[model samples]
Target chain A: QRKGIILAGGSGTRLHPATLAISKQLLPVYDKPMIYYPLSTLMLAGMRDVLVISTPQDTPRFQQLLGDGSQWGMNLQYAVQPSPDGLAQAFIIGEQFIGNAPSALVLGDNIYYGHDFQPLLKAADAQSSGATVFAYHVHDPERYGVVQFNAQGQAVSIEEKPKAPKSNYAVTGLYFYDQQVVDIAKAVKPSARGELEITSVNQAYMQQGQLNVQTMGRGYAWLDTGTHDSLLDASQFIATLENRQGLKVACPEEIAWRSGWINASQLEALVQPLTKNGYGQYLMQILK
Target chain B: TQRKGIILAGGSGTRLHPATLAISKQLLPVYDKPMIYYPLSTLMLAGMRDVLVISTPQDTPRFQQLLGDGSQWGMNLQYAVQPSPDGLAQAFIIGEQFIGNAPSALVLGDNIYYGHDFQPLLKAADAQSSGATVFAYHVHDPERYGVVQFNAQGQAVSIEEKPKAPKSNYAVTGLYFYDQQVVDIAKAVKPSARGELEITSVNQAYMQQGQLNVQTMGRGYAWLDTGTHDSLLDASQFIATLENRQGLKVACPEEIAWRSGWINASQLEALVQPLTKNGYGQYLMQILK
Candidate 1:
């Protein structure tokens, strides 16, 4: 069975004053909290067992807000990452939760939306081996882990934020890994920055001919809402998309219900108080 | 010689449910605080210490809970109930005890006034004697509001309420300054065919007696009414943009409390503690700077 893990344990010092009172993941992206997007994405991908890794201070609030996975028809487990660690450290933290199973790791602040996500996720879930990663072209590749493809269209090299980047294709935050990922992560050495970088683990897979890079073509929109300006841009982008499509995106309750993670009655109960906000109405509209 | 302030917050708010499903529109938020905070701050900025807040019976206790006795802001806040849906002129009848033969300023609960020069303008109108003063703001959709036509000498020639064909683009906003004679004039007004006393009739009486003065609001002033969905969203967007860009809240009660000298620095600091994360509290802390 494929499991899901969301890395939401960042210190979030960049969004000061706003994050001072509330967790950055708890802030409203458009209507729902920022963490809901990643959580809902995993639910839509048909992951029944999901692990949420958050800061110690915020984990209690997350439990109080989201509760056990039973309400959404899934099993949600929580872990606390006491300090700010590299993204690859999530596998070590959630090693027991995975329990010798393949898993997908998605960043809490990374939001991806497109027409082809469901089919792509299903294809990734069908794969029995190797590490699957997505590469999307971004204007500012230097701000992310860049990847280069060789003349034969194979990923030859990957570098984390080099000053002079080799290619414009940036590796997105979502990754699918086989059961060997935990062992690979344990064998990898820390980078100069003293953290077990995920890129290094992916590079280990590349050396063994076990890394597969999937290109997210022109239709997908990948957003990294790590800073204040990017957060606002993400909100505006979701607002415009919802307005143009006349439907909600990254809506947690609706996604859970549509994926059969939750039943209709359960979705209705989740939507009662929010009905006045019209968010509940959108979910009901989908049911109709 | 005392000046009284009447906050007309009585209306059936249908557009903003379920936010307004039980409460009145004035209690809703533009950004941080209730919508009434802006008009109440306007009254405080005008130096009117004795004010009456008129809301429906169901919403009166909530207002009291939100803004206690106005002693916290160096003002007197009295509440009265508007028994039914009536026109603005009925405020004089309901608030007879609050006015007490004094000149009064009537401000709508959902109307927001802001600009650098607004305080001075409101102060001048509050101090006017023996005449009625109303503001004329240029709006693109004047026909949606009470349109005021002015002559070549800048005198108000006529005031029409929601005319099909507006003579000018100037719409009279919801603030009116009137002399003590307004109480008598309001009492004398015959109900319109709609069976409600009209504030326009009171203005027309002053116009007939040559006691009306119209001040045109220039580029410096902003008058917004939050009655419809689009207008409510626009008001929120406007406040959000201003607060985000200037690092200042448009109508924060704690700032007004400190600036009006009703509270000391420590009191203001304590008042800001609950809102520290909203950035509005930081704006209030800047008052100490």
Candidate 2:
């Protein structure tokens, strides 16, 4: 996939006091903004033409911060989602930028960590037919879109927060869809909650026997850093992980350099100003 | 009227963990600095040329490593050991000679102050000659703090420590100012049930003598206590937000050093070379620009 969409639109009332001064997506997760992780995830998956969907007010700030993406050697585009629409509405908002091409969609606040994500996303990028979604076993399935598999290990059904979840596997935010996803999203009627739902679009694929769910087995960390407590936990988790393992996760500059988005000198120039606190040192070390 | 600073860094590191296991609470970062840096910076901002720092024996050397002999800030930095976890009032005893019959300000090491006109406020308090002055900050949970109740004229009438029902939302922050008599008053104070001579008792004594005055620090100021795990994270978040928005480093040693005239322009530039990358050094460079 050459194109991807990042849905960063939301009324971030839940993280007040902190968000009172800035957007939730702009808050720091470890050393970088929360949006950087998802954006870099898409970039790491080889998607250079990316459209960032944010609110009207926040779209300008995203543009100001990330720019036209030329700094990182990626073509960045921005679109505005005016209202609190459902996740499925991103396909509609980004339909023009997507341009009849297969694209991946990832939520802004959803962060995936581990070695499996690159391989899993690579496989999804190679898929020519259907929609692919990854399901990871979570402790609380009822909080997310629950996925159930039958005896043949085929994805039987997916439910968004059923009273009694049939399985512990919940669908993560990243989704790979064909060009038909735009049409499917347009056809999806507003749910009782009065928003175009992503689950409905996935069910449309399921009905066509074109929906595939890949189980993200152990060794992966899929985090929902939406709420206040979870956001703190995510920071501590990333800090502890990076501090203990001496490895960097969700580093956009490093990822862009490794993916050949920028050359060695350009990478060094980018990291030259930040070398004092060891983050810049880490980036240079990665290059070596 | 010379401005003097006293940093009460003596505290048990019970609330903080892992990081504070081997470190003192005051040395922990509140946003971009070790907590003590905030108070030290506040003192410097108030035009104080001499400052006294009080801490436990285990933490004093580390503080020296971090702050040094105060030459870096063009000020006299003196360290006093508390010998034990005593009361805030004991700072008067340990820092008596440093204070030396002069009006002084005592700021808790873990307390952070940021907002508009804070320098003017500190200078005004430091200008006083013969009474005690303290700042009151409006907190959501004032009952957990030293509550200050005031009359219609905004004159403080009663001060209660951790009252069950706070008469007002204002919680007295750790920054305080007093005349020369404060040291004598502190020496006469009886130890509380907690076995330490409490600063509240000294303030109460001043109140009884009609020598205590309270000034309210409105919403603009941010007073944070880095005493817990959650607060430590919040402090970092706050600093990151401020630095990102303002394009400046908070509690930066190099910036403070240069601003205080501890080092000349060339010396400041030399100091920033090693830190040129993380935007901290860039902020220092911008000051020169």
Candidate 3:
């Protein structure tokens, strides 16, 4: 069994008053909520049993928005991060949910879009033994966890927010980990900032030669909706794509209906309430 | 100083759907401030203290809630409901009582204007005792706008609304200046083929009366029309780039209120109280410094 965990826990101080009213994940990227992107990523991987970990205040809202996820023929669970910890702490928090199965962790604010994304997600989900981390070539690697590769194309080392990045390939927020990840996360000593860094967990896998680094080359769009400017950019990017192509992106109902998780009649009933807006109409058109 | 201002913020923003569905397009953030701040600030910069905001029946209350009776900024802020989507000239008729015996200025809710020495241009129009003034800017696509054509004598000869074959690249901007006669001028105007009272017809009336002044805005001026999603994003990005580069806010009504002596420092400080959590209020605090 493969479980999925979306870490939507954070203070979101950068986004300020916008996030002050609601969780950053609940904010709209363009047409859909921000969590829809990462949730669609999990759905694309065929992960039906998913755990959404958010702040205690936001977990109920997520529960209200996504509900048991049965509407999409998926089981959605929610957990709370009472405090602002680290990314690796998601495993510790979701330990029981992972129980002897591999898990995928995608940060809620991270969005990936590409024509080839579903196949990449399927390939990542097919892996069973090692930790899989996706890396994308970014102009600003210093802002992300830097992954250094040897001449043999092996991940030799990884650094978090390196002043001078070892490589241009920055580790994105999505991660696939084996069942041993819980044990690995338990042993990760907190860094100087007193937080269990996810890089430490990845480094442990690298040391054991069990880390599979998948480089998402060109054509894939990876967006981090963390800052105000970047958040606006993400919305603009999604709007441009949806407008130019006359299609929706990161739409949960369409993905579920296409995957045969939800039948046509069920889709039509679900889209009835949304017919007044473009989002609902798009789903209705898919039914025809 | 005796001129009254009207901001026409009505119209169904169908192009910017879902986002504008829950909120009025004018209430959406351009960068840091709301979109209404730009046009409202334009009115303030033109020395109009008494202003009326006209919007859809449902959106009128929200605008009133955001911008109160104008005492906060030491300006007389009034709001009226359009009831339905009509033409831009309808704002003049709707705001007749507000513009009683006073020359008026109208700025569309979603239009943003930025240029050096822009205040003098507005003040000059505001100081004019007669006629109407409309600013013209060169846009690549004039077909989407009300195009104005000038004759060989450098005088405005024709103004056509959304012409399929535009005679010139000069498009009329949203900001307008009209004398006290605009009320009767708007009332006497017949509805166009679209069943909307067009402001172009109003301008054409002024042109026929030899009272319409078409002022051309040259290079280095940014006239952002935030009607579509793409253009709204472009407007936001433009504001963000400028604000980040220069530690100054654009189209900030609060700053304009203080700088124009409409609101004193103490009143501005009170205004900054609730907004302190956001960086905008902090910018206001810096203004007092």
Candidate 4:
């Protein structure tokens, strides 16, 4: 079975005072909270069983806000990352949650979506034989983990250096790893800073020649909301898209309905409590 | 000399290329309003009711068409054509006829300055009698802007563009105010190797006259250059954040004029009719009632 884990860990020092009271994922991108984008991304890909991995202090509030996920008719689970740890360690923490099953680990602050995404996710799901790592082309990639694909377009090598990067393509935050990722993460060593590096986990997969690299080309947006300025840019990006198309991006209710997980009546009932700001209005239009 | 405002909207900011191909960058919407509106509103807030917009020949008519005679806002508006992508100093030379015997303020149309009580600084610069005033802002990329060094008297002693050695941290902002001498200096200045008149050169001439005042914008103010795509998007986001969080349009020219008492309710009401199709116009219609 394919499951999903949203790594909403960390103290978010870069976000500072805004993340002081709450997690960065709780902040709004455009119309909804930042976590909604990642959540909807998982749901759109037909991933039903979900685990939200937040910080020790933040899990409770996320629980209070989201809870059981019955509103969208899905089973939701929560796990606490005691302190800032490795991205790969999410599996070890969610071992029971991912028992012998393929898992997708998406960072909480990563917002992404594109047209005809259902088909893309379907292809991703079909690649259960290996891991799927999404790569995006950015102007600057030195600050990110670089992924190089071979002639067959498989992820050949994954590298990260502080200077003179290997490629212009960055391994984005979304990762769909196989069941072996949990064990692979278990055997990985902590880096110089005493945190387990996700780089090693990804390298293990690329070394085994069992990794799939999907290049998310132009027209797809991947905003790393790691800084205050980045959050605002992501906000405007979402706003511009939704306004230009007269659509609501990452609407869980809409995504749920479109994914055939909820019926029209249920969608309408969901819309009843959200009509204040045109979001509920969008739900109605989506159902129609 | 009476005060006149000139918005330099002529040069094609080459970084924002494809979008600025068919139209001047100032005509592009920063958020919901045209980019020109922010600087014009800055001038309006500064009590410069008589203004001349200097744009490339292609964009000057559009500027006139969008702003009209400025009567609705209780101001006199004029336009001058900058035939080429000349430097900021070229604005004064271009508007010599319109700004005759008057002091002037020049704001880069693509530059946006906002935050708390920053308008007061604009007004302060407006009230100055016989000197040049330029603002220095603390920027993350000091290398990208003109750096200004101040003397122990807290006066600007030097200004340099994209320096190698460190001089000062305060980067000169796009807004400038000057007395009538600015026109003469602008005319007298030689073009740089880039074949464009440099605004920093004009400031140097003023500093030699001991007529330069430096106002430093602190954390309380935001100075954003919307020349690039990223900055343009940030400008919109900043505007939206302020408007959504505080229920007021940040740089609404009509609203600013009405609140400043330059125009009355009837004038605002008349202006509201044409803008109704767009959300801003409808918003104008809604708030006036």
Best by lDDT: 3
* Recovered native contacts, candidate 1: 0.00
Q: What lDDT tens digits, residue by residue, belong to model 3 across residues A108-211? A: 88899888989988888898688888899999899888898766446888988899999999999899988899999999998998888888999999999888
Worst window of 10 by summed lDDT in candidate 1 chain B: B14-23
Q: How far is candidate 3 from the true structure (C-alpha RMSD, Å)?
A: 6.3
Interface RMSD of each: 7.9, 15.2, 5.0, 18.4
Q: What is the C-alpha lDDT of each candidate?
A: 0.77, 0.78, 0.84, 0.78
DockQ of 4: 0.02
Whole-model alpha-carbon lDDT for candidate 1:
0.77
Choose 1 or 4, whichever is better by lDDT: 4
What is every candidate's C-alpha DockQ against the true complex, given to 2 decimals? 0.05, 0.02, 0.14, 0.02
Predicted model with the maximum DockQ: 3
Off by over 4 Å in 2: A150-154, B1-289
CA RMSD of each candidate after superposition: 8.3, 18.5, 6.3, 21.3
Error of 2 at A189 (Å): 0.8
Give the poorly placed runs of model 4, Cα more than 4 Å off.
B1-289
Clashing pairs in 4: B275-B281
My TM-score estimates for the predictions, one after another, are 0.61, 0.56, 0.69, 0.53
Report the lDDT tens digits of candidate 2 across residue range B1-289: 4757899888654434223433456754444345677788888877776889998887788777767787755678999999887788999989899999678889888888777678788777777677888888999998888888766454579998878888888898998888878899999989886687888888888888877888778967888756555466767778667776776455555576677677789988886666554345566778889
Question: Please, what are the lDDT tens digits per residue for candidate 2 over residues A108-203?
Answer: 887888777788788778888888888889888888889987654457799989789989999988888988998999998889999998899989
